[PDB]
Design a protein around this ligand. Structure first.
Ligand SMILES: CCN(CC)[C@@H]1C(O)=C(C(N)=O)C(=O)[C@@]2(O)C(O)=C3C(=O)c4c(O)cc([C@@H]5CCCN5)c(C(F)(F)F)c4C[C@H]3C[C@@H]12
Lengths: 144, 469, 240, 240, 48, 48, 48
């Protein structure tokens, strides 16, 4: 957090990227460092490579690499996911007679319809396009 | 995509002009689902996406109601909507597993190490050259573009004197201008989140920083203005790397009558002009579906050669000769001629970029070789038997050809009638079916009208040079 | 409730006045995320995009997704509706069905070729009866090795119909001739015919199996495609 | 027992002891590795003319040579015995007593002063109606130079004078560890080891390293040479 | 330690099961939270 | 093999009369004689 | 491997978030009709 695209690159990106160079079956690597502080690395493996075993390999490479990460980065956590390319389906939830509101609709899809579908056989990833209710406290600088 | 530093609101205005267009294309369009703020390339307020579902294939038989007709009309959006950088409608790839959208994906690599600025200069020469090639449509940078940033510089020295911690300023400014999740409450049996952030009016502009104060060690209130200052700067929002080197992704589509390979070769020619123009030290690599396209075309010469060899060796073992396998191999060009000829003419007459050398064409050629060989074995196996039984070669070759003709034509014609349905397919999957069909069907036709004649002649020639017994 | 967050106690001032949360802020039930604005047909909507796990059938996953949703709909709030904005599975089915239409069409067309040459119902039927056995059997063998039914495997079966009827055709064409020449009985001719025909039968099978065997060895994505055609073709020819 | 499966099981169990580890140990980080390939070769980076110190070269191999060598084909792992620079503050006990300061105070002044501020974005997600611009606010606040470290504020004297870090300590950029002295041929040195990758020809990997090294020598700092202290390739070439 | 069953359900069990999605072969998840401060989440997977 | 080592012995009671706290004594020494790693900084694009 | 003891296992699941006291109320109604039904024998709540 708080870091530029150039610091995310030299501090985190390249350091993680070098650890993964010797992995078995790696076709190519593409990486991104952004001004919000986020780093992303995608690894593409050759046909023939079991995806389950490739995941256990990246994670084994990363345990050493995490040490060389900056401390605030380790604190925020490093995520490793098996990744897919394209959505199979996009489902829309909406009100026809407008007898229901969008904040309500969005809440019901995050609290009632998302986890069960994410746990449906063969599903893998599930992305939500709406939000859930949260308690929001908005501060006035002057009054503080 | 909208211009740099755009708000979500400005993006939603463009997605509405876009949604009105599709919702008004009634004959070809059923639905649209849109998300503002989300993009495959990145999440930013400027980005946006739309998923359009066309009407049933049954209800779309006219030319106007076709997929590329829609895309071309929707490409007028770029000219209509002034605000957005680009509004591009894109088809799915054949195998959507291997990609998000069809087209070509390339990476311009700064192999020399010249710069980030130099690299973007190269992208922009390639971009304008690609605008002016008529074999290409919709070449665009994929990724975020350089944006104006707001840089705050905090004087450590004055901070120390007022007595404000730099660590504390961060705490006051991380909760105020960005949000902070603190803890969880229960709503209807389910844990949710509680967030503390400043109100929108306080966090809108650079001047709004002055509204916030940080407490010192003496417990006093010190204005943010006292310890820090801000300047508008320009920089890259996101940096991209491909294989250890800094890169830029360029994605585009072939023009309406051109094949994917042709668009790929056009782009490589454009990159070739880069050194002559003055930006040198730049390299490129292909990725995604395009990488794979390149690789499949490559393996084909080896495939054809190995297949030809296995046939040749198997024939020897079966027929105990070296001369006869050569006679059967020699007739193979005759079948392959029809296959390439039907595919090329067909493409010209039909106007189809899809009828080209592709993976499907390669499977067809393999089939034609087997057909040609099969046709040659029937005449030649019988000829050798007669020669082995004392007939003179010419007489024996001639007898064979008459005896085996009706069988050969009948089998060859049935393989041809079998692929006629693939050749004349109008449904989903037709393009793949056609690629296989035309190649196989052409080979059938050439084999029947030229190969049959050549099978006796080559055998006689080889046998005369190397006499039996 | 938000009232309980407005009564959070913060401080006391010198007067002794209590400072609660409401004094410094506005409390409301809002949103976890404010990043994206999603719409369906120009109107507010929420969406769920599903990315299938590796190693799975899209068709099967889709049915399961819908089946779970069927149970979910019963407990829906009154306003809620659901439609599929983006679905790719329909094309996949239509593509699969198109090819099966093509297979049937080819078999009929091959029958006619044979009839035009054979000219007897009796002659024509024998090669034709081979097709059910060869194709059913090949489907069997291929599933033993884990090959599904897909467009590529199916294109291979269509390509094979003209190819798999060949051995049969080369057998009856001859028995038939033998008979018209020697006026012998169906069983005598068949045994004689089978002696002249066997060298040819092995040769045609050998060539047609050998052209398709090197493809399977090639690796990569292209290799995965090539092996669909080659397992099906090779199985079919041996069966024939 | 499959190596990868063994390593991941151990790391997973390790995740249940970390909270119970001392903060300091946690801060350094704890690593899990596994047995495997032998070292093909060790290259010694040394200064013949005594121009560069060990700390300097270990730092150079770390910031320059390690990554280019890793991308070289066939190289599963590149290891450097060594580490980079660290900012070092050495404290006078007497100078601290003079200003009534304790080591802890210097620590407290060093945590606050050396921080990375994070702010947010100008536009903001729940933005005001009529916001036209969204940008990113970033604050550069970290210290990169030794002088910045010596001007850090500590206290104000009764006289009102300023006592900074320079007053009570010597601040230098120094080595991360002082525990080891490494030399090649009596000359300051650092060592890098190469491990071949799975399914690879060592003879070919070795040639590739040699050529990459050839490109990087040109950009060497003055006084650096590279030579081999260990090589196993001669054995294997001879044995073939 | 020292927790009510309710405190283990709010603070511990729900937080964990929410992260439990995207698992290959998952037939069902069963959970319990108790007065002795303990939470047990059991995940059952399909055959193979 | 075992080697000679040195032990510091802190009297809490002498320290108590003085006012000094035990963890203050302990902290001083850890940093003084032992050494401490406070935080990271950036030099030439690498965090040290 | 199976603790079911050859008994049908029914998981009354509060999916609408009615609450624990309401979930218990529902269970009580279910266990009444079950005892009354001749087909069902010994239908007992599993937990505490
Ligand atoms: C970072 C401090 N320190 C840096 C000094 C290293 C560190 O402390 C770690 C750790 N704790 O992880 C170790 O690995 C270490 O302790 C170790 O094991 C070493 C060796 O055994 C070794 C060897 O076997 C063969 C050679 C080669 C073979 C051919 C010629 N000589 C060399 C070399 F000479 F190149 F330097 C070494 C150096 C040390 C490094 C230690």
């Amino acid at each position: 957090p708080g870091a530029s695209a150039e610091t995310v690159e030299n501090t985190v990106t390249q350091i993680i990227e070098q650890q993964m160079n010797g992995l078995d079956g790696l076709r190519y690597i593409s990486s991104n460092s952004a001004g919000n502080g986020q780093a992303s690395i995608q690894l593409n493996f050759e046909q023939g490579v079991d995806p389950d075993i490739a995941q256990v390999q990246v994670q084994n490479k990363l345990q050493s690499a995490t040490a060389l990460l900056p401390e605030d980065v380790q604190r925020q956590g490093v995520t490793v996911t098996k990744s897919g390319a394209s959505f199979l389906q996009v489902i829309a939830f909406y009100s026809p007679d407008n007898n229901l509101s969008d904040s309500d609709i969005k809440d019901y899809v995050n609290s009632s319809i998302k986890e069960p579908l994410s746990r449906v056989a063969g599903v893998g990833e599930v992305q939500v396009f709406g939000g859930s209710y949260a308690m929001r406290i908005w501060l006035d600088p002057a009054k503080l | 995509q909208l211009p740099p530093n755009a708000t979500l609101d400005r993006t939603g205005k463009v997605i509405d002009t876009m949604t009105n267009f599709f919702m008004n294309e009634k004959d070809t369009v059923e639905s649209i689902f849109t998300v503002s703020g989300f993009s495959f390339t990145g999440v930013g307020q400027n980005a946006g996406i739309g998923f359009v579902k066309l009407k049933d294939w049954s209800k779309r038989t006219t030319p106007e109601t076709q997929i590329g007709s829609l895309i071309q009309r929707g490409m007028a959006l770029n000219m209509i909507i002034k605000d957005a950088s680009y509004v591009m409608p894109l088809q799915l790839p054949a195998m959507p597993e291997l990609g998000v959208t069809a087209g070509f994906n390339l990476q311009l690599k700064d192999s020399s190490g010249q710069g980030h600025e130099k690299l973007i200069a190269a992208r922009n020469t390639i971009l304008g050259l690609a605008s002016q090639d008529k074999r290409l449509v919709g070449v665009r940078p994929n990724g975020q573009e350089d944006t104006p940033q707001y840089q705050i510089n905090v004087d450590q020295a004055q901070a120390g004197a007022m007595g404000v911690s730099i660590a504390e300023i961060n705490n006051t400014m991380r909760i105020a201008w960005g949000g902070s999740y603190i803890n969880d409450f229960v709503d209807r049996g389910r844990v949710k989140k509680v967030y503390v952030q400043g109100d929108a009016g306080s966090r809108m502009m650079p001047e709004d920083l002055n509204k916030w104060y940080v407490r010192n060690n003496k417990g006093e209130m010190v204005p943010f203005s006292a310890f820090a200052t801000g300047e508008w700067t320009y920089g890259s929002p996101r940096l991209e790397r491909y294989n250890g080197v800094s890169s830029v992704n360029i994605q585009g589509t072939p023009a309406p009558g051109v094949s994917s390979g042709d668009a790929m070769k056009a782009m490589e020619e454009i990159i070739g002009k880069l050194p002559s123009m003055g930006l040198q030290g730049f390299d490129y690599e292909w990725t995604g579906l395009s990488l794979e396209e390149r690789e499949s075309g490559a393996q084909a010469p080896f495939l054809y050669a190995l297949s030809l060899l296995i046939v040749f060796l198997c024939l020897a073992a079966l027929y105990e000769s070296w001369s006869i396998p050569f006679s059967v191999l020699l007739v193979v060009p005759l079948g392959v001629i029809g296959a390439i000829v039907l595919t090329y003419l067909g493409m010209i007459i039909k106007g189809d970029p899809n009828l080209s050398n592709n993976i499907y064409f390669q499977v067809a050629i393999i089939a034609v070789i087997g057909l040609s060989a099969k046709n040659a074995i029937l005449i030649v196996e019988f000829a050798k038997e007669l020669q082995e039984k004392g007939e003179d070669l010419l007489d024996a070759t001639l007898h064979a050809a008459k005896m085996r003709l009706r069988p050969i034509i009948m089998t060859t014609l049935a393989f041809g009638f079998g692929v006629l349905p693939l050749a004349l397919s109008t449904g989903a999957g037709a393009g793949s079916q056609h690629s296989v069909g035309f190649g196989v069907l052409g080979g059938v036709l050439s084999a029947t009208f030229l190969g049959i004649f050549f099978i006796p002649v080559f055998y006689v020639w080889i046998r005369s040079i190397f006499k039996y017994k | 409730t938000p009232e309980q967050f407005k009564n959070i106690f913060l401080k006391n001032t010198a007067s002794g006045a209590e400072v609660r949360l409401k004094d410094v802020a506005r409390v409301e039930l809002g949103s976890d995320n404010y990043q994206f604005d999603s719409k369906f047909n120009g109107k507010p909507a929420a969406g769920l995009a599903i990315k299938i796990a590796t190693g799975a059938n899209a068709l099967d996953t889709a049915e399961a997704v819908e089946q779970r949703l069927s149970e979910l709909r019963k407990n829906y709030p009154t306003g809620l509706a659901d439609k599929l904005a983006y679905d790719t599975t329909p094309f996949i089915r239509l593509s699969i069905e198109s090819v099966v239409h093509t297979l049937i069409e080819a078999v009929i067309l091959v029958f006619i070729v044979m009839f035009l040459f054979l000219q007897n119902w009796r002659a024509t039927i024998i090669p034709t009866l081979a097709v059910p056995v060869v194709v059913l059997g090949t489907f069997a063998v291929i599933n033993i090795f884990g090959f599904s039914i897909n467009t590529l495997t199916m294109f291979a079966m269509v390509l094979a119909i003209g190819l798999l009827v060949d051995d049969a055709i080369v057998v009856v064409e001859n028995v038939e001739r033998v008979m018209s020449e020697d006026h012998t009985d169906p069983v005598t001719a068949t045994s004689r015919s089978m002696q002249q025909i066997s060298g040819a039968l092995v040769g045609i099978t050998s060539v047609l199996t050998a052209v398709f065997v090197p493809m399977a060895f090639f690796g990569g994505t292209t290799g995965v495609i090539y092996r669909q055609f080659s397992i099906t073709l090779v199985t079919a020819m041996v069966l024939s | 027992v499959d190596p990868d499966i063994a390593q991941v099981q151990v790391q997973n169990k390790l995740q249940s002891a970390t909270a119970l580890l001392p903060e300091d140990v946690q801060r350094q980080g704890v690593t899990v590795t596994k047995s495997g390939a032998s070292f093909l070769q060790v290259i010694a980076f040394y200064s013949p003319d005594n121009n560069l110190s060990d700390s300097d070269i270990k730092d150079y191999v770390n910031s320059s040579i390690k990554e280019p060598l890793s991308r070289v084909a066939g190289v599963g792992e590149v290891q450097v015995f060594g580490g980079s620079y660290a900012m070092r503050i050495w404290l006078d006990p007497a100078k601290l007593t003079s200003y009534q300061l304790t080591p802890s105070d210097i620590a407290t002044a060093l945590q606050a002063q050396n921080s990375q501020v994070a702010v947010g974005q100008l536009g903001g997600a729940p933005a005001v109606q009529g916001q036209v611009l969204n940008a990113t606010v970033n604050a550069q606040s970290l210290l990169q130079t030794p002088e910045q470290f010596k001007n850090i504020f500590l206290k104000n004297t009764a006289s009102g004078a300023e006592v900074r870090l320079k007053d009570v300590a010597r601040v230098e950029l120094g080595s991360d560890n002082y525990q080891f002295d490494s030399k090649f041929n009596g000359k300051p040195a650092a060592g890098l080891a190469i491990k071949i990758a799975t399914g690879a020809n060592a003879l070919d990997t070795a040639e590739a390293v040699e050529q990459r090294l050839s490109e990087l020598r040109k950009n060497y700092p003055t006084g650096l040479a590279d030579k081999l202290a260990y090589d196993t390739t001669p054995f294997i070439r001879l044995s073939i």
